[PDB]
Write a protein that binds this ligand. Sequence first.
Ligand SMILES: Cc1cc2nc3c(=O)[nH]c(=O)nc-3n(C[C@H](O)[C@H](O)[C@H](O)COP(=O)(O)O)c2cc1C
Ligand SMILES: Cc1cc2nc3c(=O)[nH]c(=O)nc-3n(C[C@H](O)[C@H](O)[C@H](O)COP(=O)(O)O)c2cc1C
Ligand SMILES: COc1cccc(CCc2c(C(=O)O)[nH]c(=O)[nH]c2=O)c1
Ligand SMILES: COc1cccc(CCc2c(C(=O)O)[nH]c(=O)[nH]c2=O)c1
Lengths: 313, 313
Amino acid sequence: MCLKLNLLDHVFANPFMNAAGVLCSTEEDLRCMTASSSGALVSKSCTSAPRDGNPEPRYMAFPLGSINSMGLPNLGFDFYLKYASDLHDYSKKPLFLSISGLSVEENVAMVRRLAPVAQEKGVLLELNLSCPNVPGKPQVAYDFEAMRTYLQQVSLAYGLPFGVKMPPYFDIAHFDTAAAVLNEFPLVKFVTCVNSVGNGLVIDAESESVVIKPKQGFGGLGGKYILPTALANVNAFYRRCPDKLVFGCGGVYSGEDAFLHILAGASMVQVGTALQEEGPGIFTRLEDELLEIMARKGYRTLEEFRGRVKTIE
Amino acid sequence: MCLKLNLLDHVFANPFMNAAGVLCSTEEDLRCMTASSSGALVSKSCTSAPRDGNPEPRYMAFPLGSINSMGLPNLGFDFYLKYASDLHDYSKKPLFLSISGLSVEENVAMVRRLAPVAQEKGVLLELNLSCPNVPGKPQVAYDFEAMRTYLQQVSLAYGLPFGVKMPPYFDIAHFDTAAAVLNEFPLVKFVTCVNSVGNGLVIDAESESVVIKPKQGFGGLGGKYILPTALANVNAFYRRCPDKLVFGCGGVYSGEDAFLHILAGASMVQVGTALQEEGPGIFTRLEDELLEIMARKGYRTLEEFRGRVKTIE
Ligand SMILES: Cc1cc2nc3c(=O)[nH]c(=O)nc-3n(C[C@H](O)[C@H](O)[C@H](O)COP(=O)(O)O)c2cc1C
Ligand SMILES: Cc1cc2nc3c(=O)[nH]c(=O)nc-3n(C[C@H](O)[C@H](O)[C@H](O)COP(=O)(O)O)c2cc1C
Ligand SMILES: COc1cccc(CCc2c(C(=O)O)[nH]c(=O)[nH]c2=O)c1
Ligand SMILES: COc1cccc(CCc2c(C(=O)O)[nH]c(=O)[nH]c2=O)c1
């Protein structure tokens, strides 16, 4: 019985990795993730310049999940490129680098410079589309014309297989349109579903206050709140993009939650909130729990059940 | 101390009512809700003709909430209008009738008939902008030009104060655009935030199956999953629509959860999943729990704290 996968011309001990943004901002964070039992890691979404991000408090967690408005704090592209080019030990596990430029030209400039490191060292790009463009317009993946522009420009500039991190959708028309846009781009080889469920509001009853400072308390939701939303998006894109991989992200706290993602169609399974709360020891637990479910069911590999969710009659 | 309030030229014993679709489809159901301690009730969203809805199973509930693809099963508009005109006892509490025609023309036709019953009896209209998926077209509330048409046509056909049931939004630009649409219509006097979080997917690990039959398992989410989403929408529209009431719906299982909705801006608080799960006794509990929290805080009225959620610096 084994959790091994081979995808995107890389080998993964297991499907688990951090979600972008969690335990991956600094060198220390990345070394931690690399030392962990995860199958892979992804770096913090970066911009060309370093950013301090929003004022604190900007992340809070509770029994059913988390809310954040971090504001994209990161050490800048050059740092993450250096990590990929010179610091990461590729013999431990594969690395993904997430980018989240604030404009199409910022993304273009970064992927141009990432390309030769991707070709030589095998770092994999995750382009964050669940991200701001012009303020007063919707996030890029909620603006299908902007999304198409970003993918056309990045595809031309980068020229290598990459993946995309998508926000959740809630309307079948959006699943259809979004997948049709992605399917225009043969270099988009993986689709990570989902980013945080946007602009939730957590309020603390005793203090009568929101719990994060930015944006009058509005921020993206993760964790137990979002698992059925995550599963729906994984399955919706799994069905609509048969020549791409789907990576699942959202609501994973247990090997059972991971097994659901994989039944829905997930290849890799990313862990955000639960990892932020539990720490990297979660990866040994999740591996053990998923293997126990597989043993009970007589499954020896992930492919035996990936995308095999049953429908009713 | 009592929770009675006056809105829309009606008196309410308390701010609680059922969510449209729950405990409100048949004459039995409407009599049950009338006999409950709720402050008001709303009927099942109706179409001009009766509908059987989708194949079963089409609703399921879990510790953290529910998923449904009911398919607008309903007894038809003539039935609900007859209930409003002849059967309902207005001395007990106010009645809202929810309409969800499958086209603008259907909604126009129904509202032209409701108008004199609204004048004579005081039934209130809640216009549901959500409908079964039509391939190629987004939900009405997610297509701002369609939304503007519906509201223009209904406002003209009806001529009296009404409200609108909204799905959730997840992007600040969308809040801005949606509220600006709504603010074009002075007869829209209340906005109910929110309908179920669309197209989630619940999977059972043991059976490896989805749990509802229609739509390959995809359905709207209610319950604990959606409380922060619901609060964010309530507050976003409370802030943007100062000349309107906001009715909160989503994730209410306790007087604390109701308290948070009211803090966010809610005038009435609607209860769906929890009501479906617990039954109509829930209203006496929610009333007791909300009065208990008020008493611990020193609040004597709902107006003292409605909309008064605090932000940080
Ligand atoms: C503190 C924090 C920072 C995040 N930063 C990023 C980011 O930089 N890029 C990104 O693609 N997603 C980011 N996200 C989203 C996560 O990658 C993940 O999509 C989301 O939290 C849902 O997964 P979960 O339910 O396991 O938390 C962040 C989430 C959290 C909680
Ligand atoms: C079984 C069921 C049927 C519903 N039918 C309707 C409907 O006819 N009209 C409507 O506006 N919303 C309908 N809804 C949505 C609810 O009114 C409510 O917006 C949603 O369930 C969120 O509230 P909750 O978290 O309390 O369940 C339905 C919900 C459920 C669970
Ligand atoms: C630039 O300000 C931003 C506002 C919202 C989202 C983002 C992208 C980064 C990001 C963040 C973040 O850094 O806030 N949090 C998430 O949950 N997902 C994300 O993708 C940037
Ligand atoms: C599958 O049937 C529908 C899909 C979307 C919307 C509607 C309208 C009635 C409705 C329903 C329903 O009857 O399925 N369920 C909801 O959670 N909200 C609603 O507004 C039906």
